[PDB]
Amino acid sequence: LAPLPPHVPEHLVFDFDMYNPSNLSAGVQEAWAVLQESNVPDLVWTRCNGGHWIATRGQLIREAYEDYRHFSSECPFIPREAGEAYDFIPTSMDPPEQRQFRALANQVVGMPVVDKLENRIQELACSLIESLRPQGQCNFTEDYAEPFPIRIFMLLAGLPEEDIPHLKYLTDQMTRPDGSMTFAEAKEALYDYLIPIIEQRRQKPGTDAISIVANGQVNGRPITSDEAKRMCGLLLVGGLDTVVNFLSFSMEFLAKSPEHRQELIERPERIPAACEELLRRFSLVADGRILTSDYEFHGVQLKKGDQILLPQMLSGLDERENACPMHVDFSRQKVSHTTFGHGSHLCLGQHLARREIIVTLKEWLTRIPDFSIAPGAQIQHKSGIVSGVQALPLVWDPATTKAV
Ligand code: MNR
Ligand SMILES: CC1(C)[C@@H]2CC[C@@]1(C)C(=O)C2
Numbered sequence: 001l002a003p004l005p006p007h008v009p010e011h012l013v014f015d016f017d018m019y020n021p022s023n024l025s026a027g028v029q030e031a032w033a034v035l036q037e038s039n040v041p042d043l044v045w046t047r048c049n050g051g052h053w054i055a056t057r058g059q060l061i062r063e064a065y066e067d068y069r070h071f072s073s074e075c076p077f078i079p080r081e082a083g084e085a086y087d088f089i090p091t092s093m094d095p096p097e098q099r100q101f102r103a104l105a106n107q108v109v110g111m112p113v114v115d116k117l118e119n120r121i122q123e124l125a126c127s128l129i130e131s132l133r134p135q136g137q138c139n140f141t142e143d144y145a146e147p148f149p150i151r152i153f154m155l156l157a158g159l160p161e162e163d164i165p166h167l168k169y170l171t172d173q174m175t176r177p178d179g180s181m182t183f184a185e186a187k188e189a190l191y192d193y194l195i196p197i198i199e200q201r202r203q204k205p206g207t208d209a210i211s212i213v214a215n216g217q218v219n220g221r222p223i224t225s226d227e228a229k230r231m232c233g234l235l236l237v238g239g240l241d242t243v244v245n246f247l248s249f250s251m252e253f254l255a256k257s258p259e260h261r262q263e264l265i266e267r268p269e270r271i272p273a274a275c276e277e278l279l280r281r282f283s284l285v286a287d288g289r290i291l292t293s294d295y296e297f298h299g300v301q302l303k304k305g306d307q308i309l310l311p312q313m314l315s316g317l318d319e320r321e322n323a324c325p326m327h328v329d330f331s332r333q334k335v336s337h338t339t340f341g342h343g344s345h346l347c348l349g350q351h352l353a354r355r356e357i358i359v360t361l362k363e364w365l366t367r368i369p370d371f372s373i374a375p376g377a378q379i380q381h382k383s384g385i386v387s388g389v390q391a392l393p394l395v396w397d398p399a400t401t402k403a404v
């Protein structure tokens, strides 16, 4: 715990630990939902991880992400040392300076690139699933959730697959550190990995994402090696620790709900809609902003330098935004959420993300329509900047499957 600030009252003090929530046993989304009970106010202050504010309602979360004049992304992570050390592009920048870098990033992970990767995304998903199909079991996180998105990213970035263990270890320390590395150390290690590669590719320009970024232009002018490094690092974290985790949350749910599997099996055209609803119910990101100065936000005096966590995860879980929020309804009329962010920093990889999600759902249910959680298994989650699933052992009767 950290000493309570002067401007911070006492009634709004909710000691929530984003890296180890109290009710984590009931599921991470459930763990964060406690901040939305009637007994909890919209905005509270926690003395965990150094102390910071936490907007618990979609209304304030959205509003803050729109007002970059008061809530700067210069220091988006908690603890403060992580946020101060955090210098990824375009995320650590505020408009207007931020805007120019998003276009370059779009060139390597935007829809146009997703279109090119279409065949390979499809091919890998089918190959991985068909290999598991006759086994009647798997460790989903390790056998599919990780290799599917990560191998696609490494392909696009032109990096050898043998480097995945090292890179995945580093990305995970920046989102869910095990204590062996500070965010700054993990970040510098990722940059150390990228530096020589970016230099190599600025000399012999290739087709990969790192080459395109490294030799790119920012609103008409050349990108520096430092700027390319800072952008490439972010792309690595996005490709290695986002969809990877979400897929496990989604499959855990399907493994636990036969009725929902049946729905998508009977009406595959609903998969895209199902994806969106799962993105809301199993939202998993939570980063924030920093006050550029003294500001009275919703009757709560915010001082300059103060960090405020704006959980993208909480918006769509707000009973005020969606009726019966913890319930998964593929026919939900208005699936409200900020799973991919809000404001000028809206996720640039959401198109690649949705394609990977939709393809996984369609191709998995096509070959393994029926599956369940391994008997006696208790699924354990993990919380942090990006929440995840520790392990997801699945089982099924091979006789109920079908090879395409
Ligand atoms: C490899 C590419 C990426 C993939 C895949 C990907 C997949 C996902 C994903 C999967 C389910 C979720 C959820 C996700 C969530 C986010 N994502 Mn996404 N993301 N994502 C980026 C690359 C990627 N994301 C980049 C780049 C930005 C920064 C944009 C900017 O700062 O202007 C971004 C930004 C964001 C933000 C904004 C954070 C902020 O405002 O500080 C959220 C939230
Ligand atoms: C919060 C995020 C998911 C977004 C893309 C990767 C991430 C960890 C960042 O640093 C920006």
Ligand SMILES: [K+]
Pocket (backbone or CB within 6 Å): 074, 075, 076, 083, 084, 085, 086, 087, 092
């Ligand atoms: K910073």
